[PDB]
Amino acid sequence: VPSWPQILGRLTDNRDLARGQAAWAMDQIMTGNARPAQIAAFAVAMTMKAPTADEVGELAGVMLSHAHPLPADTVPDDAVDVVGTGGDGVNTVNLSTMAAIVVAAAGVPVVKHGARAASSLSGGADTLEALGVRIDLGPDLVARSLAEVGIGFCFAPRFHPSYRHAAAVRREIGVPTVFNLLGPLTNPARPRAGLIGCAFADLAEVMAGVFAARRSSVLVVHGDDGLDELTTTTTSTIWRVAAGSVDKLTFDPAGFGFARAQLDQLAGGDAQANAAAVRAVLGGARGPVRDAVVLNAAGAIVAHAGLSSRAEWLPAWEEGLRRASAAIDTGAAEQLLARWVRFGRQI
Amino acid sequence: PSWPQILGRLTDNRDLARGQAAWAMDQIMTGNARPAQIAAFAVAMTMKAPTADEVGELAGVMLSHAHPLPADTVPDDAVDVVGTGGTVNLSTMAAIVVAAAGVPVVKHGARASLSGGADTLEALGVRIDLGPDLVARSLAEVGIGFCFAPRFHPSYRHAAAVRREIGVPTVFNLLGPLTNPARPRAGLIGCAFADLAEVMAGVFAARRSSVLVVHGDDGLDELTTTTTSTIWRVAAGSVDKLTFDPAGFGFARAQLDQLAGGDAQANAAAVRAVLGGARGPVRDAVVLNAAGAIVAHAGLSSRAEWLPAWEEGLRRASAAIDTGAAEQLLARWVRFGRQI
Numbered sequence: 001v002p003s004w005p006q007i008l009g010r011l012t013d014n015r016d017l018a019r020g021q022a023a024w025a026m027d028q029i030m031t032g033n034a035r036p037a038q039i040a041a042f043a044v045a046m047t048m049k050a051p052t053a054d055e056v057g058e059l060a061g062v063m064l065s066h067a068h069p070l071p072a073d074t075v076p077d078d079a080v081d082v083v084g085t086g087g088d089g090v091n092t093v094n095l096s097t098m099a100a101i102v103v104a105a106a107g108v109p110v111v112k113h114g115a116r117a118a119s120s121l122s123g124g125a126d127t128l129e130a131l132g133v134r135i136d137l138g139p140d141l142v143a144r145s146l147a148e149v150g151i152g153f154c155f156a157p158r159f160h161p162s163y164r165h166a167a168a169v170r171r172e173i174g175v176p177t178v179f180n181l182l183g184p185l186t187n188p189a190r191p192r193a194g195l196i197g198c199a200f201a202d203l204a205e206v207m208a209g210v211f212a213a214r215r216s217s218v219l220v221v222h223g224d225d226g227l228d229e230l231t232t233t234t235t236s237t238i239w240r241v242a243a244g245s246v247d248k249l250t251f252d253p254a255g256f257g258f259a260r261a262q263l264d265q266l267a268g269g270d271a272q273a274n275a276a277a278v279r280a281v282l283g284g285a286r287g288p289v290r291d292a293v294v295l296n297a298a299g300a301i302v303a304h305a306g307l308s309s310r311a312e313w314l315p316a317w318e319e320g321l322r323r324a325s326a327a328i329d330t331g332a333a334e335q336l337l338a339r340w341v342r343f344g345r346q347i
Numbered sequence: 348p349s350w351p352q353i354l355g356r357l358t359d360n361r362d363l364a365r366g367q368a369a370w371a372m373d374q375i376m377t378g379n380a381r382p383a384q385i386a387a388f389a390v391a392m393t394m395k396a397p398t399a400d401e402v403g404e405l406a407g408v409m410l411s412h413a414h415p416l417p418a419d420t421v422p423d424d425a426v427d428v429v430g431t432g433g434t435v436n437l438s439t440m441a442a443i444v445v446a447a448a449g450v451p452v453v454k455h456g457a458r459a460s461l462s463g464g465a466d467t468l469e470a471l472g473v474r475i476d477l478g479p480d481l482v483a484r485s486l487a488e489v490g491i492g493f494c495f496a497p498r499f500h501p502s503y504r505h506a507a508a509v510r511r512e513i514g515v516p517t518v519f520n521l522l523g524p525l526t527n528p529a530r531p532r533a534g535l536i537g538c539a540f541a542d543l544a545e546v547m548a549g550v551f552a553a554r555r556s557s558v559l560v561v562h563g564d565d566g567l568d569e570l571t572t573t574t575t576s577t578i579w580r581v582a583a584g585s586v587d588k589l590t591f592d593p594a595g596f597g598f599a600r601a602q603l604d605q606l607a608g609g610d611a612q613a614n615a616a617a618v619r620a621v622l623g624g625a626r627g628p629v630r631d632a633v634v635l636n637a638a639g640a641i642v643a644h645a646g647l648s649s650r651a652e653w654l655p656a657w658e659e660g661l662r663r664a665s666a667a668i669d670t671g672a673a674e675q676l677l678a679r680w681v682r683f684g685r686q687i
């Protein structure tokens with residue numbers, strides 16, 4: 001007999017939920033059956049209790065059940081995502097989005113989950129829109145984008161319409177909660193690999209556990225400067241997910257010859273400014289922004305490689321860095337973006 | 348100040364800065380807080396164990412918005428008798444007994460809501476929803492008054508709706524005893540959680556109230572007769588924690604299933620029974636808790652001594668029942684409501 005008093009009482013008593021209770025709660029939320037007060041109580045109570053991977057996996061599972069799927073047999077088994085929680089409070093250029101373009105241009109299929117800004121000046125979806133990319137495509141056309149261009153963009157609101165009730169509560173309360181983890185865990189194309197940024201150092205291991213449960217090949221990353229990306233200003237903590245297990249690592253870009261950057265060198269502006277930064281990087285502009293893009297693209301390619309049990313960490317990184325740099329240098333990334341824009345205008 | 352700031356601080360398991368709880372409660376009380384924000388705050392403040400300063404700020408804001416009683420209508424030595432819940436039967440009866448002994452009582456509550464159970468008083472025929480002027484008249488003429496929370500705290504309705512929707516106890520469950528709009532300086536205040544009882548005692552200490560904050564060691568939000576109780580004795584701005592055993596005053600041990608309150612109609616029947624002289628564990632616990640309230644009343648003077656105060660309180664409580672004064676006071680309270 002599941003109910004809000006039972007579930008919220010258990011959480012406020014600092015107890016983990018019984019199997020299925022988080023799922024019940026999320027389903028009530030997704031079906032419009034939860035009062036805003038109940039949604040907010042649930043999100044906050046779970047956050048302060050400390051969510052488990054089982055619980056977060058249940059929430060993401062329910063979201064994915066209610067999402068619009070892509071058509072059968074349209075997502076390659078090795079497709080990758082590059083996406084983060086956001087909420088790092090830094091307002092950088094759109095590193096995941098730029099990395100995603102480069103990854104696809106290197107020949108790794110990318111189905112990117114994304115959304116507009118929550119607290120920053122310009123989100124991934126905002127910047128793509130400013131570049132002339134269509135962010136408004138449904139399942140069939142995203143599938144066609146992936147096949148024809150090598151990248152698809154799943155705009156979260158378009159694929160998760162039933163999340164509107166939760167999204168409203170999240171905006172109202174402002175404080176980050178367990179809900180802030182869900183975007184990266186609920187790509188509707190269900191790619192099995194990705195580079196997944198987490199702004200909240202204390203919740204990254206839980207995100208990794210969710211991916212581990214799905215047997216995804218993922219690097220969950222938190223820059224030690226607070227970025228929900230692999231950073232160039234310092235080390236990053238990586239929760240490496242492979243073969244159903246999570247391994248905690250610290251990553252230093254200096255190990256691959258990257259010079260240290262300052263965080264203000266990665267600072268972003270409005271959608272137009274960040275669109276300009278994308279163009280500059282894909283056009284061959286050298287500097288800190290390119291370095292961060294290449295590093296993150298490489299990370300995603302490493303995750304992709306980890307779909308094979310044969311993959312080795314250092315060779316994977318060297319290969320990833322080589323491929324990412326080459327995809328920019330040959331013009332492949334610049335061309336792929338142009339083709340992506342042309343594709344959307346030809347619909 | 349902001350919701351992101353305050354909620355973020357709480358989710359980080361940090362005590363709030365001076366004034367932040369007050370800001371939040373003020374937003375809630377002015378109708379400026381969305382239900383999601385009300386709920387987030389209530390939950391966060393509960394899970395980040397609230398401090399006396401914080402609870403005091405919440406209660407303060409609430410009282411700053413409340414309708415007061417008219418000037419000089421609340422006696423300086425008026426008392427409250429109430430529990431936070433987890434015993435409306437016990438506190439209702441004890442209140443009548445205390446008033447019948449000649450200690451002015453002013454209660455505050457809602458229908459089972461800043462202190463549920465006013466349904467029992469209604470089941471007995473008492474008009475619970477009176478404005479400030481008439482509560483004042485009731486106090487003077489009958490010796491007891493009841494401040495109906497929706498009437499005196501109309502701005503709380505937004506919070507009240509949220510509490511019902513989430514349906515789990517929160518920090519707001521502590522506010523009833525701390526937001527009596529008559530602002531009695533004394534009382535017997537029950538609390539079902541030991542840790543939170545101490546917090547409530549700190550709030551009362553800050554107001555220089557003379558109160559006994561009581562928690563049965565069996566979990567009851569009243570002085571129990573099934574075992575010992577913890578009392579936080581508040582007087583002179585300081586708190587003394589005590590273990591109390593009513594066996595010392597000759598009270599037999601009862602079982603918990605004999606004392607627990609039921610619904611309004613059941614509660615009402617029990618009131619009539621006890622006020623009419625029915626002996627047993629329920630009477631004992633009423634007498635004990637009535638005596639506690641009288642002891643708190645006595646503590647408004649610096650020259651009150653613990654055991655002699657208890658012995659007087661118990662004699663006064665017993666006599667108020669046994670003479671029929673308690674029964675008659677209830678009848679006069681019912682008559683009052685009809686005579687208006």
Ligand SMILES: O=P(O)(O)OC[C@H]1O[C@H](OP(=O)(O)OP(=O)(O)O)[C@H](O)[C@@H]1O
Binds near residue numbers: 087183
């Ligand atoms: O407004 P914030 O809460 O700070 O979030 C900024 C962006 O980061 C996340 O996406 P993603 O990793 O796809 O975008 P990126 O290209 O900016 O890294 C999120 O969906 C936002 O678009």
Ligand SMILES: [Mg+2]
Binds near residue numbers: 084085095228229
């Ligand atoms: Mg990102």
Ligand SMILES: [Mg+2]
Binds near residue numbers: 086
């Ligand atoms: Mg980012």
